[PDB]
Each structure stands twice: as structure tokens, then as C-alpha cells.
């Protein structure tokens, strides 16, 4: 075979050429923190959360984008990997709004959870945060853009899976806004799935909005009947009442998406 040997924390693993650092760490059972990487979207590399130390190399690499070279020792838990994660989590939480009680992502937030797991416990940002104009992209997806961390899973999903090309980033620098630039209504057949992949509560479900909260929901694994695809879903209920419908991953059917009628 053409498998190259790399090392994750000293453990040998045989990987295909072209495999990234993140996938090599996944093959030894370690999940690198990420915000913009998504395994069904194109590699962006613009949140810098996956920065990891390769040893004998004085610069961290973006594990979601960097291919492994033969003989690398990926240090997923070293001192400068943790310092990189804390610095990037500090910059993500600098201008992020204190909305966790009134945000629907609370409890099932990637930003909350891997701030608890990989960032620090306190703030140094002594300034005033930014605030972003909200957008009206339709009756399904509520949009609160102050919570946006600009990971561009919006744009990659709408471009590559939904095939729409109507989301994007306007502006430049810290005023860079994810949006449509116009009053445009993002109504695709797969338009609600951006609620899934948005790691923050910038894009939430407008019908699910404010009604429940993820830890109190019971997760019943079930099947879509809205068409003959047979999409695997999670009906999340709460005290004998159906709260919402999430997808299940099935690699051969619905990869991890569902349609808007299903959702």
C-alpha cells in the first residue's frame, strides 16, 4: 500500500496520502477542536481553532487544512497547542454577545462547550463589543448576526450542497458581515440545514425559537415519512410533546441533512 506513517502524540498511525492532520488525529480517537471545518463542506481554514503543534516545527499548522507529511509527530495536547486554542477562543469570545440565556444554542453550543474545554475561564477584553444588524433571510431561519463568528459554513453550504450562491461576506476586517447584502429570502429546499451547521446561535430555527432547551429534550431516533428518501431523524420531545426534528447521520441516505418539510 501507499500508506504513510505519522504520529499523533507519539502513537503511530498509517494514513493515506492527502489525509489531513485532523483526520490523522481522528484515526487515533482524538477530536481536534474546530469551528469552520466541516467534513461535508470544503476546507476553509479561517477560524484557526484547530491549530496544533507539529514537533520540531516552530509554527502551529491548521489541522483541518494541512496534509500530514511522513514522520510528523502531531502534539494534540502540548503547551503551545493549548496556548493557540486559548488565544483563538479569546478572540472568538471578545466580540461575542453575552446572550447565552436568551440564545437558543445554549447547552448545545459548540462555542460554549469548547470554550469550557479548550479556552480559558475568564476575560481580558476591556472594550466595547461590536453589534451587527440582523438579517431577514426568511421565515424558517431566525438570524441574529451579532452571535456570528464568521466561520463561513453558511456560504459553503449554500454554495456547495444547497447550490444557491446567495450567501456571502460583505465588508472587510472586523466589519465583515455574513449575509445576502440585500433583502433576500433564502428559501431553498435544504435551507434549514444551516441551522444545524452554524456552530453558534447566529442562525436558529424560527419555529423552534425560545420554546425548549437541549438538555431537557428526549431524543427518539426515527424516520422521515415526508417523501420516499427515508431520512433518519431525531424527534426531540419534551414532557410528552414533540419539540423539533433534527437529522441523524446515515451515510447512504441523507448524509447528515434533511429537507425543510422534514424539519
Amino acid at each position: 500500500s501507499n500508506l504513510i506513517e505519522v504520529f499523533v502524540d507519539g502513537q503511530s498511525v498509517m494514513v493515506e496520502p492527502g489525509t489531513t492532520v485532523l483526520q490523522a488525529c481522528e484515526k487515533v480517537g482524538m477530536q481536534i477542536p474546530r469551528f469552520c471545518y466541516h467534513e461535508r463542506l470544503s476546507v476553509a481554514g479561517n477560524c484557526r481553532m484547530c491549530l496544533v503543534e507539529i514537533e520540531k516545527a516552530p509554527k502551529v499548522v491548521a489541522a483541518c487544512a494541512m496534509p500530514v507529511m511522513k514522520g510528523w509527530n502531531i502534539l494534540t495536547n502540548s503547551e503551545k497547542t493549548k496556548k493557540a486554542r486559548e488565544g483563538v477562543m479569546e478572540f472568538l469570545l471578545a466580540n461575542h454577545p453575552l446572550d447565552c440565556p436568551i440564545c437558543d444554542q445554549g447547552g448545545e453550543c459548540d462555542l460554549q462547550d469548547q470554550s469550557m474545554m479548550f479556552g480559558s475561564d475568564r476575560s481580558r477584553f476591556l472594550e466595547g463589543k461590536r453589534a451587527v444588524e440582523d438579517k431577514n433571510i426568511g421565515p424558517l431561519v431566525k438570524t441574529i448576526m451579532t452571535r456570528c463568528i464568521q466561520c463561513t459554513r453558511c456560504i459553503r453550504f449554500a454554495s456547495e450542497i444547497a447550490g444557491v450562491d446567495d450567501l456571502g461576506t460583505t465588508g472587510r476586517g472586523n466589519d465583515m458581515q455574513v449575509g445576502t447584502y440585500i433583502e433576500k429570502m433564502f428559501m431553498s429546499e435544504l435551507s434549514g440545514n444551516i441551522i444545524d451547521i452554524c456552530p453558534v446561535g447566529a442562525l436558529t430555527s424560527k419555529p423552534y425559537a425560545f420554546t425548549a432547551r437541549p438538555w431537557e429534550t428526549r431524543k427518539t431516533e426515527s424516520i422521515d415519512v415526508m417523501d420516499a428518501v427515508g431520512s433518519n431523524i431525531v424527534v426531540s420531545t419534551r414532557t410528552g410533546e414533540v419539540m423539533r426534528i433534527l437529522p441523524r447521520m446515515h451515510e447512504d441516505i441523507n448524509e447528515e441533512w434533511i429537507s425543510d418539510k422534514t424539519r
Binding site: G45, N46, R124, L126, E127, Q150, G173
Partner: protein, 430 residues
């Protein structure tokens, strides 16, 4: 040789730097350009690459990567994709105005450099990405390109050598980050000038996904002179691994701000006193010098006394050579206000792609805006240091490095002035 400087006019590459001679083809051929270009193009890519490697030319953009080793990355058989030279003519660096003078006053030297470098790397064409604010310079370069096509020097059967080579000029639209090479490549492709993550380097996937070398105007324009005059000629200047001549842009608090060509390892004091008329108020009036444009850390007057203006000596002076743009700041300078205007520049010129620059350059600008007024406390200084260390090396391109480095230079050489600023704010506002 131990002392460097005092460069002779016969050893200049950029004759007609000042517009006193004709910039067109009748003037450029009368100064040595487009002479024996066919005999250079017929000796093969390997000879031209060996002349550039032999000359010790390093990248005049400012990183100082070895230009022959860089251009040899393209010397490989094709796979169906075309290959491209792309000449980085953006020049957005505050302090730096040398490539404007190369494009505007020696344009045929740049076009001949495009032809020689594209033959060296097997490139199909040259895309000169000129800054859009350089409109008259771009029309100037297009007139020279039209004169080169009408003389058969480029295009179909370039210089009668059987090599086909176009030269295109693409204008920018007002982004300093479109001088970064991958963001420039994205800007040519009709996109936001957002830098790519490396690898792939542009020699693998560059403009339109082709093999591409992005190279500065100066490091392209000196290459026909390196091929004619020889590699040993250009390597006989400056220190070792510091070979050649260099354009310098001495601006700020000097008597005569100017662009001048000078030998590589010239002293900074000798350069400022000789070509720029010296610091205003005398050399005792000198407070700081930013050696190579805004991205390099400043060095104070104690360092500027004996420092040499090549790459390695300024690295030993814990700064960089950069674009060799000498920004001179005398004792009458609010230096915190100057570095904070510089951080304001770096947050207006930042494409917002990755998190540490998009958030931390704005956060550094807010901390520096409070440091100008002194509306802070000294524990925020080292804090700001750490913020810069969270941006340096954690970004996609080096604009995070170029925005973290002036903060680090200002803290490192002028922490007491920051502290007395803040304590006088404290004693007069409470």
C-alpha cells in the same frame, strides 16, 4: 569587503529612477534594456535560474526568500495546466514607494524582467497586478507594453526566440492585503482578496489553479541586469547572503525624503545622512527609525547608530529588512500616536478572514487608542504583548505578523514612555 555603501552610477540597475531620461523604448534601449534578450532566452531556463541563484538575489518584496530557489520550484514538466509569472506591483506598505518608481520610470525593464523570468520558469504569460491607485503608472506601463509588442519583444515569437509570452496588467481596487501573494491570486480571479492557506504554494496551485510564481517588481526588474551583467557581479555587493543593490525609500522626519538605489549592507546612519539630507534637527534629534516599512518593528537611536541595512543585521537588531522603507521619527514625535495610527492602518487593511487578525487587530487598535490618551493601567501593557503573541504565527498570512510586530517594537523600546503617559493621565484625571 567590510564597509558597504558608496555605490557608483555604473553599478546601478535602476538608471532612470528619477524620470530625467526617456522612459519609453527609445530611452530604455539607449540605457541597456532589451539588449541581447534573445541570447538570454535561448540559453535555457536552467542557465537563467543558475544566474539568479548564483547572484544571491533574495525576494525584494520583503520576506527575503531566495529568488532563484523560489523560481526553480516551477522548473518541472507540465501536466496540461499553463504556467504563470505574476508580478506583485501592489506596494501597499506605508513608507514604501519604490515599485511605483520602477513601473513609472523604468517600465521596459520590468517588461524585460517579466519575459526573462517567465522564460526561466516556463511561464505562459505575465500578470502584473498593479495597485489601482497607481492609475497613471498603470497606463504608463501599458504604453511600454504596447511599445514592446510593436517591436516584437514580447508576444508571438518574443525577441525572435520562438518563445511565446504575453504580459497582462490587472489593476487592483484598494486593498493592502491584495499585495499578499495568495490574496493577490484570489484578487485576479475575481474574488475578495482573501489569502489562501499554504500548502498549496502557488508553484503547485496558483492563479486559476495553475503553477504560478508571484514576485515583486524589483526582484523581477533586476533579473535581466543579473543575466547580462552576471551573477557574480550582483553577488559582489553587500554582505554574504545579502547580495546586491536595493531601493530605499527614506521618508518621515528627514530633510530630503527620497527614493535612492544603494548597495545592500550600507549603514543606516550613512544612508540617512548621505542620500536623505539627515534627520531634521540633526542626528541627536533622532528618536526612532522604522527600518523597512510599517510591518517591521521600530529600532531606537541607540540601535540605529551601527546597524546595517540588509536582512541579517536587522534580524540581529530584532526587526526585519522588509521593503527597505526607512521611516524616520525625530524627538518631536508622539511615537505612541504614530504606532497607533499604524495599527489603525492594519485594521482598515485586514480582510477579516481568520479569527486572530479579524478580532485581535481591532482589539490592539482599541488598546493602542487608549494608550495614546493614556486611558489605561500598566498591567495592560504586557497583556497587549500577549495579545500580539496570540496573533503572531496563528494567522493565515503575515499581516497578523505585520500588525503584531509594531506593537512589540513599541512596547520593547518605549515601555517607560507608555507608563509615564498612563500615570500622567491618572494623576490629571483623578
Amino acid at each position: 569587503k567590510t564597509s558597504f555603501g558608496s555605490l557608483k552610477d555604473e553599478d546601478r540597475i535602476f538608471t532612470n529612477l528619477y524620470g530625467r531620461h526617456d522612459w519609453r523604448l527609445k530611452g530604455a534601449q539607449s540605457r541597456g534594456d532589451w539588449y541581447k534578450t534573445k541570447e538570454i532566452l535561448l540559453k535555457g531556463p536552467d542557465w537563467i535560474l543558475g544566474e539568479v541563484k548564483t547572484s544571491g538575489l533574495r525576494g525584494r518584496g520583503g520576506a527575503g526568500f531566495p529568488t532563484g530557489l523560489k523560481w526553480s520550484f516551477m522548473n518541472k514538466p507540465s501536466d496540461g495546466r499553463p504556467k504563470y509569472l505574476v508580478v506583485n506591483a501592489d506596494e501597499g506598505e506605508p513608507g514604501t514607494c519604490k515599485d511605483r518608481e520602477i513601473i513609472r520610470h523604468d517600465p521596459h525593464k520590468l517588461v524585460e524582467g517579466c519575459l526573462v523570468g517567465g522564460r526561466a520558469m516556463g511561464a505562459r504569460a505575465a500578470y502584473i497586478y498593479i495597485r489601482g491607485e497607481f492609475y497613471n503608472e498603470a497606463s504608463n506601463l501599458q504604453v511600454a507594453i504596447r511599445e514592446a509588442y510593436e517591436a516584437g519583444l514580447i508576444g508571438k515569437n518574443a525577441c525572435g526566440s520562438g518563445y511565446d509570452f504575453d504580459v497582462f496588467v490587472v489593476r487592483g481596487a484598494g486593498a493592502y492585503i491584495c499585495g499578499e501573494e495568495t490574496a493577490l491570486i484570489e484578487s485576479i480571479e475575481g474574488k475578495q482578496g482573501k489569502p489562501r492557506l499554504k500548502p498549496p504554494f502557488p508553484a503547485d496551485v496558483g492563479v486559476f489553479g495553475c503553477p504560478t510564481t508571484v514576485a515583486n517588481v524589483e526582484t523581477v526588474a533586476v533579473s535581466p541586469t543579473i543575466c547580462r551583467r552576471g551573477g557574480a557581479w550582483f553577488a559582489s555587493f553587500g554582505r554574504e547572503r545579502n547580495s546586491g543593490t536595493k531601493l530605499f525609500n527614506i521618508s518621515g522626519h528627514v530633510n530630503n525624503p527620497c527614493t535612492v538605489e544603494e548597495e545592500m549592507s550600507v549603514p543606516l546612519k550613512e544612508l540617512i545622512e548621505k542620500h536623505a539630507g539627515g534627520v531634521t534637527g540633526g542626528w541627536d534629534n533622532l528618536l526612532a527609525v522604522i527600518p523597512g516599512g510599517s510591518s517591521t518593528p521600530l529600532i531606537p537611536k541607540s540601535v540605529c547608530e551601527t546597524v546595517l541595512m540588509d536582512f541579517d543585521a536587522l534580524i540581529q537588531a530584532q526587526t526585519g529588512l522588509g521593503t527597505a522603507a526607512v521611516i524616520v521619527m525625530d524627538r518631536s514625535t508622539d511615537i505612541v500616536k504614530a504606532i497607533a495610527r499604524l495599527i489603525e492602518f492594519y485594521k482598515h487593511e485586514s480582510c477579516g478572514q481568520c479569527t486572530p487578525c479579524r478580532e485581535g487587530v481591532d482589539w490592539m487598535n482599541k488598546v493602542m487608542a487608549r494608550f495614546v490618551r493614556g486611558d489605561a493601567r500598566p498591567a495592560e501593557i504586557d497583556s497587549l504583548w500577549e495579545i500580539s503573541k496570540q496573533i503572531e504565527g496563528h494567522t493565515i498570512c503575515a499581516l497578523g505578523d505585520g500588525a503584531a510586530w509594531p506593537v512589540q517594537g513599541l512596547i520593547r523600546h518605549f515601555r517607560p514612555e507608555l507608563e509615564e503617559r498612563m500615570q500622567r493621565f491618572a494623576q490629571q484625571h483623578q
